[PDB]
Amino acid sequence: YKTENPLYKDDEPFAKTCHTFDYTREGTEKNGLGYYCLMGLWASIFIWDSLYTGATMPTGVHRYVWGPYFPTAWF
Amino acid sequence: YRHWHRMSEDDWALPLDSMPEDVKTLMATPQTERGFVEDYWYNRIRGEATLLDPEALPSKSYIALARDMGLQIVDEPSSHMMGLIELYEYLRGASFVGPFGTIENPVLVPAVGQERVVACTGGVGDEEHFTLWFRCREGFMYRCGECDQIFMLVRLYYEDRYWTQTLVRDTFMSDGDMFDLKTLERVHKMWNKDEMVRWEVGYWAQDYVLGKGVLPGMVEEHTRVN
Amino acid sequence: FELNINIINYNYLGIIITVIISIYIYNNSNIISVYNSNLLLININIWMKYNILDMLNLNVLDYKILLWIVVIIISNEILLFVSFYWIYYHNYINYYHVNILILNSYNIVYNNIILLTLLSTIVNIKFYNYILSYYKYILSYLIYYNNYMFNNKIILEYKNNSNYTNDSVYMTSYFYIILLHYIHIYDSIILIVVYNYVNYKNINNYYININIYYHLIEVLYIVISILLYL
Amino acid sequence: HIPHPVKYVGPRRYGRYVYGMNRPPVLRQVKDWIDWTGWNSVFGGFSFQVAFGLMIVSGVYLNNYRATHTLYY
Amino acid sequence: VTRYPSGTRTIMSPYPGGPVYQWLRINYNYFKRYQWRRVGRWQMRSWCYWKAAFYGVPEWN
Amino acid sequence: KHFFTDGANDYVTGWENTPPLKFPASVMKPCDYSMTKPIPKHWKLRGSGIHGPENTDLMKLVLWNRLKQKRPQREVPNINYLKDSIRLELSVNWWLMSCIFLWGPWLHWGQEYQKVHEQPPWAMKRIDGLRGEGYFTWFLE
Amino acid sequence: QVPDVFATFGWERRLTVIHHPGVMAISKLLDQRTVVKPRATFNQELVEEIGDYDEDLQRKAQVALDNGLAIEWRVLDFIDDELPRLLAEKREIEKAREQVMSKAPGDYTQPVFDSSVVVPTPANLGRNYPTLNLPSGDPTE
Amino acid sequence: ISTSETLNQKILRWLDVTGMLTRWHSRREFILDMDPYFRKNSGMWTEWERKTLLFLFYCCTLATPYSAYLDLQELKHQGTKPPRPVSLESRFMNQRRYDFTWMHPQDKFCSECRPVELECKKMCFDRYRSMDYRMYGFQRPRIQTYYSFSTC
Ligand SMILES: CCCCCCCCCCCCCCCCCC(=O)OC[C@H](COP(=O)([O-])OCC(O)COP(=O)([O-])OC[C@@H](COC(=O)CCCCCCCCCCCCCCCCC)OC(=O)CCCCCCCCCCCCCCCCC)OC(=O)CCCCCCCCCCCCCCCCC
Ligand SMILES: CCCCCCCCCCCCCCCCCC(=O)OC[C@H](COP(=O)([O-])OCC(O)COP(=O)([O-])OC[C@@H](COC(=O)CCCCCCCCCCCCCCCCC)OC(=O)CCCCCCCCCCCCCCCCC)OC(=O)CCCCCCCCCCCCCCCCC
Ligand SMILES: CCCCCCCCCCCCCCCCCC(=O)OC[C@H](COP(=O)([O-])OCC(O)COP(=O)([O-])OC[C@@H](COC(=O)CCCCCCCCCCCCCCCCC)OC(=O)CCCCCCCCCCCCCCCCC)OC(=O)CCCCCCCCCCCCCCCCC
Ligand SMILES: CCCCCCCCCCCCCCCCCC(=O)OC[C@H](COP(=O)([O-])OCC(O)COP(=O)([O-])OC[C@@H](COC(=O)CCCCCCCCCCCCCCCCC)OC(=O)CCCCCCCCCCCCCCCCC)OC(=O)CCCCCCCCCCCCCCCCC
Ligand SMILES: CCCCCCCC/C=C/CCCCCCCC(=O)OC[C@H](COP(=O)(O)OCCN)OC(=O)CCCCCCC/C=C/CCCCCCCC
Numbered sequence A: 001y002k003t004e005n006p007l008y009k010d011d012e013p014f015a016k017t018c019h020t021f022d023y024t025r026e027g028t029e030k031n032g033l034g035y036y037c038l039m040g041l042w043a044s045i046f047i048w049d050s051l052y053t054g055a056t057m058p059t060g061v062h063r064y065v066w067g068p069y070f071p072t073a074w075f
Numbered sequence B: 001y002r003h004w005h006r007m008s009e010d011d012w013a014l015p016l017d018s019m020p021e022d023v024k025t026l027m028a029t030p031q032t033e034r035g036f037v038e039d040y041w042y043n044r045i046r047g048e049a050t051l052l053d054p055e056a057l058p059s060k061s062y063i064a065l066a067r068d069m070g071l072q073i074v075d076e077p078s079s080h081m082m083g084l085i086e087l088y089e090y091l092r093g094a095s096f097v098g099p100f101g102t103i104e105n106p107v108l109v110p111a112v113g114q115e116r117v118v119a120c121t122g123g124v125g126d127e128e129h130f131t132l133w134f135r136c137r138e139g140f141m142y143r144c145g146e147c148d149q150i151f152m153l154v155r156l157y158y159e160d161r162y163w164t165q166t167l168v169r170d171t172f173m174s175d176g177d178m179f180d181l182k183t184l185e186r187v188h189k190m191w192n193k194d195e196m197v198r199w200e201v202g203y204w205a206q207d208y209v210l211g212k213g214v215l216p217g218m219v220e221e222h223t224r225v226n
Numbered sequence C: 001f002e003l004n005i006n007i008i009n010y011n012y013l014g015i016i017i018t019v020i021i022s023i024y025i026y027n028n029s030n031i032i033s034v035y036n037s038n039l040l041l042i043n044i045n046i047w048m049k050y051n052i053l054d055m056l057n058l059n060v061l062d063y064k065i066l067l068w069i070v071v072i073i074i075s076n077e078i079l080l081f082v083s084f085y086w087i088y089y090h091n092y093i094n095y096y097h098v099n100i101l102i103l104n105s106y107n108i109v110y111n112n113i114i115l116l117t118l119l120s121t122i123v124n125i126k127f128y129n130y131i132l133s134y135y136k137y138i139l140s141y142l143i144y145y146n147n148y149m150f151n152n153k154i155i156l157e158y159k160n161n162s163n164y165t166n167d168s169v170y171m172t173s174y175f176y177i178i179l180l181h182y183i184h185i186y187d188s189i190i191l192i193v194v195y196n197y198v199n200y201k202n203i204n205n206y207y208i209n210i211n212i213y214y215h216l217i218e219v220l221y222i223v224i225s226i227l228l229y230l
Numbered sequence D: 001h002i003p004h005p006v007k008y009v010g011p012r013r014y015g016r017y018v019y020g021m022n023r024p025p026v027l028r029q030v031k032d033w034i035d036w037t038g039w040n041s042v043f044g045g046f047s048f049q050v051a052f053g054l055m056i057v058s059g060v061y062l063n064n065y066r067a068t069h070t071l072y073y
Numbered sequence E: 001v002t003r004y005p006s007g008t009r010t011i012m013s014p015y016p017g018g019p020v021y022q023w024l025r026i027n028y029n030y031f032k033r034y035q036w037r038r039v040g041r042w043q044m045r046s047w048c049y050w051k052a053a054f055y056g057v058p059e060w061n
Numbered sequence F: 001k002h003f004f005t006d007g008a009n010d011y012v013t014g015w016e017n018t019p020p021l022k023f024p025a026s027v028m029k030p031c032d033y034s035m036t037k038p039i040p041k042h043w044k045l046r047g048s049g050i051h052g053p054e055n056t057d058l059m060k061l062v063l064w065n066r067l068k069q070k071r072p073q074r075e076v077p078n079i080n081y082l083k084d085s086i087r088l089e090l091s092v093n094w095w096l097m098s099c100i101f102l103w104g105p106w107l108h109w110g111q112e113y114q115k116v117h118e119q120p121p122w123a124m125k126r127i128d129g130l131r132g133e134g135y136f137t138w139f140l141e
Numbered sequence G: 001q002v003p004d005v006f007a008t009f010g011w012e013r014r015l016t017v018i019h020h021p022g023v024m025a026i027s028k029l030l031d032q033r034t035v036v037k038p039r040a041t042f043n044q045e046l047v048e049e050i051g052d053y054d055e056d057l058q059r060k061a062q063v064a065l066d067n068g069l070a071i072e073w074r075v076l077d078f079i080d081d082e083l084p085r086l087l088a089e090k091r092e093i094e095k096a097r098e099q100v101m102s103k104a105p106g107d108y109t110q111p112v113f114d115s116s117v118v119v120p121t122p123a124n125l126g127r128n129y130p131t132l133n134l135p136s137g138d139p140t141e
Numbered sequence H: 001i002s003t004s005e006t007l008n009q010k011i012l013r014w015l016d017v018t019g020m021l022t023r024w025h026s027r028r029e030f031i032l033d034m035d036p037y038f039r040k041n042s043g044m045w046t047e048w049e050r051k052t053l054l055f056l057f058y059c060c061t062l063a064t065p066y067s068a069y070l071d072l073q074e075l076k077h078q079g080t081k082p083p084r085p086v087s088l089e090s091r092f093m094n095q096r097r098y099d100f101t102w103m104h105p106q107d108k109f110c111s112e113c114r115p116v117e118l119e120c121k122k123m124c125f126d127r128y129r130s131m132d133y134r135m136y137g138f139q140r141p142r143i144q145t146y147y148s149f150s151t152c
């Protein structure tokens, strides 16, 4: 006969009834890419604030190749 | 039931030390005169004596076989009583939900006493109304003043007693032919020989019939330090 | 059938315990208070005896009721610490520029964190054994050694500190927050001294309570360590 | 809870210990153990100290070295 | 296959060990099992907080 | 899991709302009679009709929940369950390892540097003439 | 005709259900742990895994597998001596199964076989096996 | 030296002097090391649970010596704590409305000293001793007593 080691079997599913438990569409099982992006931004802000102290006090002279109403100027 | 705790060790079997030492009188006592411990060992001794005799089982009718094991044959009266007992026990820790009650099929409200408090919540959906509590007393067909649902009290009563599993057994089960101690001895020798004891309840039971501490090793078995 | 609950009709410990409390107020000697505290300990033990005897009722909801009571107690302990943190941070604007020596961030914090982490690991192993229906004798004595070091370190720190409660609100809050944590460590000693193996196992409320409580004490110290030492 | 299979894909048995013969390299054994018991506990346990250590020790460059070379006065 | 007394022979090496090693292994095994664990057995059995709760309570029939 | 929950982590009584998936539907099934076809008018109500042990599935659920409590061998769970049972224990152990082998070395290094240079290696050196170690957590300055 | 019976479980808290009298008889028979015995059947893969935990059992388990024996674990410890009886026992059990299965319906006569080699049976109740949990080797060697 | 084993086997043997490695690699050796009452339940353990338990147990015990070393260094540090400058009594420093007596409501020992101000108490105890009233403490040189953690 043939057998499966219980330790490596898959988790049993929730029973399908009138009262069925379902977590498949919740998206709460694990941290997603958005969470790891927040971590990346936190690291970037932490490094950036220390590296460039004058960033919070930017220069006021404005020089635009295509003026201030051109999209590249805004960013 | 969900409101019961874990099964105890006794819920499965009893220790042999609880076996009554006067086995000869135990097997002759009528069922109505046997206590919980006495009844347990009467059934186990008599039940295992028939089950440990393979050559006789095929020729034994189910009625006789059920009697030997102490199992009660079901009939409409006994089934009715047992069913209402379990419903009462279930409702101790479970919700009370069922079909809408009418004159033809009143809501059944099991009770041991003459009275039990009940609430009516109306029908389903919009027909459901606020809880209306009332005292459901025996002998009246109660009608909710709001939804006109019909309630009735069912009493688990019988001859100055309330229905219990033991009461049902005593009322309906009939003692058969008196247990023969020769069968106990015959089965005892079948499974217990030359220091091998594969039928231990019979070994103890046979020892008690012979007095106490007669069979090999039983004196050492009964000697305790505390 | 039977009643859902086996009612308790009478009790006399409540009167004794309440009177014991009053004796603290009406004392004329602090020696009476010391002996009064022993009476309180004795009578509280009797109350714990009644809880164990209630197991005979075989009531499924008894475990749940006590567990949620502990949850409420844990919340009260957390909120009590919050008030001390509130007191500490209210005067934050007056700290760090007064002529007092604040604690170092290298020695005390590291060894205490390491020491208290070991305490958590010991309790975790106790929980694992409790899951496996198993026991290890040495574990309890590791806790006692752990508690011995904690007492020895805290006693020396207070005695060798060169600033006093009356020097500044900073010092008062430091001493008080550290004492409050110690008292909760001592309460843990009170609980853990009776740890044994009971054969009814996972229906024993004591095991889950001890695991929750020890975890709370350790996490509270992390907050204290960040606030005061780091 | 979402049911899911066991992710462990390493060897399930090394065989009976016979004076440490016919067994994998030590580093491979350490990797197998963590696979068997779960990397999630490792990452969670080490995450706090790694975050604190990096933040403090990064100041050696961010706070000390850069500041000396970047002071407009 | 030869079975040695539990805790007396190592399985890590084919060589049982030298006299000092054997003395340390045998005597720690004895000290743990028959000397140190006396204290634990004494605390677990003779001073159980939960047993003391049922002292004087009638037996359960 | 550590905490007791009546619905999921019910280890005090072991009650389970549904039977195991091993049993065939004929042997035992979850208690669901929501799909029962309409009752013919000529049928008459014999039982109470009340939700309870008269229903076969509920009776079998109650029976199994009591008789499952004795089993010859363990019902071995998969490694995923075993990991979850001691998730906190394993993580606290790894946290202890991190404190010993990560925090300890750099904390020791900082104190040694502080001895020679009067301030931790992760702090700006002062020019104001005040003596002492100064701050430790630089990013909270 | 098979009458229905009440089956009750529990000592102080008693649960009653309707059951098959024959099934209950089998249930109580299987509770006679000294009479009705569980027996193990091996496969090559499982036998190999046993060696990881008990080398001696692996060798004895291999013998049982090679002869296709369903064997009790206690007997397996003495398979070196019990093998000739176990082979004889296997043949007698197979003979009895063939006879009873092949018999026409309603024929409940006992099978014809040599019960002296089948254990546990009234003809042979088995041997008093001594415990093998004792050490034989000297630690200092 | 013994040449009947490899170097790795020799190292493993000595690390196994208390049997830790043997119990890890043998289920039988582990269960037999349990006391009989708890060995009854050992059959239900999976190998994953057994080895995981040992891993947690060994990590804890192996880390205890390290914590002891840290505690000893802490005790030595406190035993020889360098003196600090005497505090200048600033605007809001050392404010008192009443004497310190909460420790001794009736005896009122060292009413002027703070609860853990050892040097103040020492001089206060000396006054009481000079008044023929005994008091315990502060009399033995630190280097002449055990467990002081102040010896050279
Ligand atoms: C040639 C010999 C070489 C020896 C080298 C030294 C080795 C010393 C090892 C000491 C380890 C102590 C660990 C303490 C934590 C608790 C351990 C534990 O759980 O025990 C359970 C164990 C059994 O418990 P159980 O409940 O029955 O069973 C539970 C399990 O089921 C079953 O439990 P288990 O069997 O799995 O237990 C595993 C293990 C778990 O723990 C570990 O494995 C941790 C190992 C940590 C290593 C620490 C080494 C420290 C050495 C430092 C040296 C520094 C020198 C500096 C020099 C400076 C120069 C300027 O526990 C033990 O084995 C503990 C030690 C048992 C000895 C008991 C007998 C009394 C003490 C004998 C000491 C002999 C020393 C000889 C030295 C000779 C040198 C040539 O408990 C006991 O045996 C009872 C209590 C006593 C145990 C602690 C004894 C402490 C002895 C310390 C000796 C070293 C002192 C160094 C001083 C240096 C000053 C400068
Ligand atoms: C920056 C670096 C430094 C960081 C420092 C951090 C410092 C943190 C300090 C924390 C101190 C320690 C506290 C916890 C000690 C125990 C630890 C432990 O054993 O953990 C492992 C263990 C893990 O459990 P497990 O079952 O093995 O879980 C397995 C898996 O994890 C998966 O489990 P699962 O997900 O399947 O779920 C099962 C488990 C999952 O649960 C847990 O495992 C709990 C884990 C908590 C860990 C602590 C994280 C921090 C929580 C912060 C909460 C903030 C509350 C809001 C504050 C607002 C302020 C304005 O459920 C339970 O165990 C149920 C426990 C009972 C909960 C009762 C909650 C009552 C309060 C409800 C909210 C009240 C406000 C309502 C407002 C809205 C009104 C409309 O946790 C427990 O079993 C602990 C439960 C017993 C203690 C509960 C204490 C509740 C206190 C409630 C306070 C409410 C105050 C409300 C007023 C406030 C404003 C005035
Ligand atoms: C050309 C220029 C180029 C320039 C290049 C520059 C390069 C720069 C590189 C920068 C790199 C940045 C990277 C950012 C992205 C990160 C992505 C990532 O992985 O994020 C997620 C990652 C991990 O998150 P995750 O994925 O969710 O974790 C996975 C888990 O396995 C989830 O699984 P789990 O949930 O199952 O986990 C286990 C969990 C399972 O839970 C359970 O089992 C259930 C119960 C849970 C509740 C527990 C209740 C309480 C328990 C009681 C027991 C306590 C024991 C301890 C007691 C202690 C007593 C003292 O249990 C636990 O974890 C908790 C129990 C374990 C022990 C807890 C110990 C206490 C914790 C609280 C205190 C923490 C503070 C301590 C402070 C120190 C001490 C005071 O997050 C982080 O690592 C945080 C991000 C940090 C960012 C820092 C940025 C600043 C630093 C920059 C440094 C470099 C700058 C150098 C200069 C450059 C100049 C140019
Ligand atoms: C604060 C300062 C630093 C403090 C650091 C503290 C560190 C504490 C670590 C503690 C570790 C315990 C290790 C236990 C090893 C047990 C094995 C063993 O050695 O058994 C031998 C042997 C076994 O015999 P057997 O079992 O019959 O074997 C016969 C077989 O046929 C043949 O079978 P076999 O061949 O297998 O048996 C022999 C085999 C047995 O051994 C092995 O094969 C070992 C295999 C397992 C190894 C696993 C790792 C063990 C743990 C390592 C810990 C490393 C610590 C590193 C510390 C660094 C500190 C900087 O090989 C050996 O015997 C080699 C032993 C190697 C010992 C290494 C000692 C290094 C000392 C370094 C000192 C550095 C000082 C720096 C100062 C700087 C100042 C500026 O019996 C003993 O253990 C003998 C005990 C009696 C010893 C008497 C010692 C007398 C000392 C007199 C001193 C007088 C001073 C006067 C001063 C005057 C001033 C004016
Ligand atoms: C001043 C700050 C506070 C300190 C002063 C004293 C405060 C005293 C208040 C004590 C409150 C106690 C509340 C307890 C609620 C939880 C009870 C509980 O779960 O106990 C049961 C639980 C498990 O029992 P089982 O039988 O398995 O199951 C129970 C039934 N299912 O048992 C335990 O918790 C065991 C407890 C053992 C240790 C008892 C120690 C008592 C300590 C009292 C301290 C008094 C000190 C007084 C000092 C006064 C001067 C400062």
Ligand SMILES: CCCCCCCC/C=C/CCCCCCCC(=O)OC[C@H](COP(=O)(O)OCCN)OC(=O)CCCCCCC/C=C/CCCCCCCC
Pocket: C106, C107, C110, F100, F101, F102, F103, F104, F105, F106, F107, F108, F109, H070, H073
């Ligand atoms: C072919 C390529 C080979 C490359 C090999 C690379 C080898 C690199 C080895 C690096 C070793 C680094 C060791 C650092 C140890 C520092 C120990 C230390 O500071 O101890 C003190 C401190 C406690 O001191 P306190 O006085 O209390 O002060 C702090 C709290 N108040 O204790 C600790 O830190 C204990 C923790 C020890 C950490 C040990 C780290 C070991 C790292 C090994 C790395 C090996 C890498 C190998 C790479 C191989 C690539 C082929």
Ligand SMILES: CCCCCCCC/C=C\CCCCCCCC(=O)OC[C@H](COP(=O)(O)OCCN)OC(=O)CCCCCCC/C=C/CCCCCCCC
Pocket: C024, C025, C027, C033, C158, C159, C160, C161, C162, C163, C164, C165, C166, C175, C176, C179, C186, H102, H114, H115, H116, H117, H118
């Ligand atoms: C067999 C004997 C065993 C004895 C040992 C084991 C048991 C130990 C029990 C736990 C002990 C916990 C003690 C808690 C109080 C500690 C007091 C303390 O340290 O206070 C001082 C510390 C810092 O002070 P400084 O000296 O200025 O620090 C300068 C450093 N050189 O903090 C304080 O001053 C605050 C003091 C708060 C004390 C609160 C304790 C409760 C006292 C209540 C008294 C009530 C009396 C009135 C009548 C009612 C009686 C109930």
Ligand SMILES: CCCCCCCCCCCCCCCC(=O)OC[C@H](COP(=O)(O)O)OC(=O)CCCCCCCCCCCCCCC
Pocket: A027, A030, A031, A032, A033, A034, A035, A036, A037, A038, A041
């Ligand atoms: C009562 C007090 C409690 C303590 C105080 C809490 C205050 C803050 C609490 C916030 C919530 C905490 C949990 C967050 C969980 C999480 O990460 O949640 C992760 C989620 C994504 O979820 P999933 O990945 O799981 O699907 O992220 C988000 O929804 C938002 C964070 C992602 C990144 C946002 C980017 C912000 C951009 C800002 C501008 C940057 C400019 C850069 C210029 C170069």
Ligand SMILES: [Zn+2]
Pocket: B120, B121, B122, B129, B132, B144, B145, B146, B147, B148, B149
């Ligand atoms: Zn109504």
